[PDB]
Amino acid sequence: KYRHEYYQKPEEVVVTVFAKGIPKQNVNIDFGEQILSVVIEVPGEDAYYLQPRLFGKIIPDKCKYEVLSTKIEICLAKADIITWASLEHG
């Protein structure tokens, strides 16, 4: 696939997808009150999906992301100032 990690500040959560040289155009990212959806398009085979149901809730209009050549950074804006214990929610 493609590796992902996350770190957090008290106000945002920052998901990194390590994807070298992804065209700005191939990344399709949408936000929900408690979901994130990352779908980078791979030319050969199936797309990459990172589509968790998020731990905490977020402010989708305040969410940003950035395609970067080594990685894709996604700044998720925490709805509540509360420390998440995982990216996802089991």
Binding site: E5, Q8, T70, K71
Partner: protein
């Protein structure tokens, strides 16, 4: 650009204890660094058993110790696995591992600061002897970044542009406190290395001119 994070509660307290109490056994900082640096080499080595191309960025596994008398900095560099930016933010200050609290309790219960390693916060031992630390690292999966802090309750991560690029790994620079000027001498360093690194299996070299030792 740079981004700023504040040290997690627990770690601020620990960083205070470290940099504000006078401890005797400050010399184990070099042990903890040389170690944390071995551990890092192990990782990129294992990752390379099944992918010879992992070390392409920089094929030699090593540890270099570079004392600059002039700027008053001891600096350690490795060709270990390195840190991604995410790794920097997560390990060097944002997440407080369990040993952090445990350690401080133990400290006050009269344990010795040299145990700082066994409790999973070895890195910060650097502030025993340094007033400012500047970690610069490059991991295969990300670009080179620079972590810097003075233990003033926060730290910065910044993407490296101006800097000389490492193939892979990490360059910790310790801007030494006044009293701690002794860790710049070639004899002292050579001692300390021999004294604690009799289990670590990569070339440690001392670029206070040239060569490697035991």
């Amino acid at each position: 650009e740079t981004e700023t994070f504040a040290f997690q509660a627990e770690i601020n307290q620990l960083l205070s204890l470290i940099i504000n109490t006078f401890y005797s056994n400050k010399e184990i900082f070099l042990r903890e660094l040389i170690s944390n640096s071995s551990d890092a080499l192990d990782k990129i080595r294992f990752e390379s058993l099944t992918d010879k191309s992992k070390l392409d960025a920089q094929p030699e596994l090593f540890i270099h110790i570079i004392p600059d008398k002039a700027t008053s900095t001891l600096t350690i560099v490795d060709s270990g696995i390195g840190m991604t930016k995410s790794d920097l933010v997560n390990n060097l200050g944002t997440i407080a591992r369990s040993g952090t609290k445990e350690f401080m309790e133990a400290l006050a219960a009269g344990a010795d600061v040299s145990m700082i390693g066994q409790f999973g916060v070895g890195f910060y031992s650097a502030y025993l002897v340094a007033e400012r630390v500047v970690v610069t690292t490059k991991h295969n999966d990300d670009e080179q970044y620079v972590w810097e802090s003075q233990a003033g309750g926060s730290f910065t991560v910044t993407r490296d542009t101006s800097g000389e690029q490492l193939g892979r790994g990490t360059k910790m620079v310790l801007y030494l406190k006044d009293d701690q000027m002794e860790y710049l001498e070639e004899r002292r360093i050579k001692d300390l290395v021999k004294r604690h690194s009799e289990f670590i299996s990569y070339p440690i070299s001392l670029w206070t001119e040239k060569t490697t030792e035991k």
